[PDB]
Write a protein that binds this ligand. Structure first.
Ligand SMILES: *[C@H](O)[C@H](C[C@@H]1CCNC1=O)NC(=O)[C@H](CC(C)C)NC(=O)[C@@H](NC(=O)c1cc2ccccc2[nH]1)C(C)C
Ligand SMILES: *[C@H](O)[C@H](C[C@@H]1CCNC1=O)NC(=O)[C@H](CC(C)C)NC(=O)[C@@H](NC(=O)c1cc2ccccc2[nH]1)C(C)C
Lengths: 301, 301
């Protein structure tokens, strides 16, 4: 019992982090087989990255694998990430893949500086394609990831902080999530909605653990609920989301539309000095798979 | 910028998790050097552990480390912790200590099932010596820990769950935090109070990240603050604590008794639909060390 914000174990990723130095810039790299991945703006000092990358030589890239300096023997750019081929393959390379996640999904973040892990925490890909992270100067190149039995599905690499304090980044194939670019120019994050299907996973998790004050005996239709979601800046609820909330419904015996009626009252009336799972706000960075993982103890060998 | 409930890298601790089976109990063990630490109620089926234990043989203790079956060559009991001596030293053993934490201190918990890391999160030793975890059946043996440069400071092992859904356990020398015992009797947690110095630290961390709606130009005396603390179920504040919150005060240029006055008026008036650091509650699970280290980017080799 209990419900915490849980991060994946970070050991499989720690073994990959290295330090990338080029000029005045030191950031974090990700070393998988013989390739080291980093943010391309490590080669900056509104740039011209292509221009900037042909002026570099292999010997300008200093790669620390801890107490071991790595030798670069090639480079190339793939969108906003720098692929640095080095003469050694990482003995700690896990089974991995590169996936690009959808907004509303979550992932874990190993924050790194100078190549050494600082901490790990759990994030969601907001609907405005930002993430609310903890990143300081030097964290760039840190990555986000999920674990699938033995497989690290890397889904984020870190690049920048926006003026509101939220963060922006790219998949491991270099493509930014959302309309963000790797430049100190100004850009707005965009209006963040609330991930409705996740709030509803989180309530199912509350029922599973014995917070039940918010439940009622009213029911609603998807249309009459979604009417209310778009007044509170919640995200529209689809039948596909209703199908995903299935097993959670079946476990608790609370129909999805029934739980939708509880989110309506909570939305219109507030919470009234009570808490759900320790929070006094509706939590939306728990997908339905996250709730089931945690509320059933799925592990990752 | 940003502030998250951050956990320590759990890599050095994952290499230490193992299954420990005995009868039809299965739980996790911590394997440092050639001793495997686990909870003594693995030998359970109000017991007399003396009698239960004098009464197993080494071959009762199934100790699995992945696809490797460690032979137990001896055993012994230190309070509520079983020490399973085995023939193989763990090549992945890091520098470690066993330390006992004080109420208010924080740590990371690598939840585990069948010796397999499931996920990692951060916690506090409540002032009633409970913790608020996410533990399912089979999680016992999971450990709480801190990191200190390169050294793992194990401080907690899980044993049980109290009826209100909170968790209890021991240091690694076997001794329970708080007045709990490893029996299926009834114990109530006892009145929990809010870790005041931590709330103040969380407030500093809010200032350091720009959340500014709750501060004022009032001050108070450590006495008249603690007077109001006693009324809101808040731990008293010491000069020791004031000394401790110094560097945060020095960084923000807000005297500690000034932040006490801000807390005082958050407590008597509440937050009024506003949020601090994405929460509608005064969060008390960050130490001054937690805040400093995250708002500074301390890493770990
Ligand atoms: C790399 O480690 C670092 C990570 C930043 C630094 C501190 N916290 C972080 O998240 N990356 C950078 O410093 C970015 C540089 C690349 C070339 C983008 N920039 C930043 O994060 C800085 N701000 C911006 O660049 C910035 C301003 C702005 C306005 C509109 C839209 C986007 C946008 N980005 C921070 C440090 C101010
Ligand atoms: C070990 O994996 C397991 C972990 C529990 C199971 C569910 N959540 C957990 O953290 N430990 C146990 O099952 C404990 C057995 C030892 C011998 C204590 N017991 C429990 O945590 C159970 N609760 C109690 O038995 C219980 C309630 C209570 C109240 C007052 C005093 C003592 C006391 N024990 C769980 C299954 C409810």
């Amino acid at each position: 019992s209990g419900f915490r914000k849980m991060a994946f174990p970070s050991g499989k990723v720690e073994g990959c982090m290295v330090q990338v130095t080029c000029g005045t810039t030191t950031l974090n790299g990700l070393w998988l087989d013989d390739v080291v991945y980093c943010p391309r703006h490590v080669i900056c000092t509104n740039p011209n990255y292509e221009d900037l990358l042909i002026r570099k030589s292999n010997h300008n890239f200093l790669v620390q694998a801890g107490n071991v300096q790595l030798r670069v023997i090639g480079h190339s750019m793939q969108n906003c990430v720098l692929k640095l081929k080095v003469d050694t393959a990482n003995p700690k390379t896990p089974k991995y893949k590169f996936v690009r996640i959808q907004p509303g999904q979550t992932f874990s973040v190993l924050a790194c500086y100078n190549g050494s892990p600082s901490g790990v925490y759990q994030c969601a890909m907001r609907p405005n394609f930002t993430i609310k992270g903890s990143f300081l100067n030097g964290s760039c190149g840190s990555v986000g990831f999920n674990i699938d039995y033995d497989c690290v599905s890397f889904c984020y690499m870190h690049h920048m902080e926006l003026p509101t304090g939220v963060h922006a980044g790219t998949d491991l194939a270099g493509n930014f999530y959302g309309p963000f670019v790797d430049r100190q120019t100004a850009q707005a994050a965009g209006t963040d909605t609330t991930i409705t299907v996740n709030v509803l996973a989180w309530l199912y998790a509350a029922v599973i653990n014995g917070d039940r004050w918010f439940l009622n005996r009213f029911t609603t239709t998807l249309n009459d609920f979604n009417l209310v979601a778009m007044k509170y800046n919640y995200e529209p609820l689809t039948q596909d989301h209703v199908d995903i909330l299935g097993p959670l419904s079946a476990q608790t015996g609370i129909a999805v539309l029934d739980m939708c009626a509880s989110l309506k009252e909570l939305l219109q009336n507030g919470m009234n000095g009570r808490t759900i799972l320790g929070s006094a706000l509706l939590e939306d960075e728990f997908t339905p798979f996250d709730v089931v993982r945690q509320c059933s103890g799925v592990t990752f060998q």
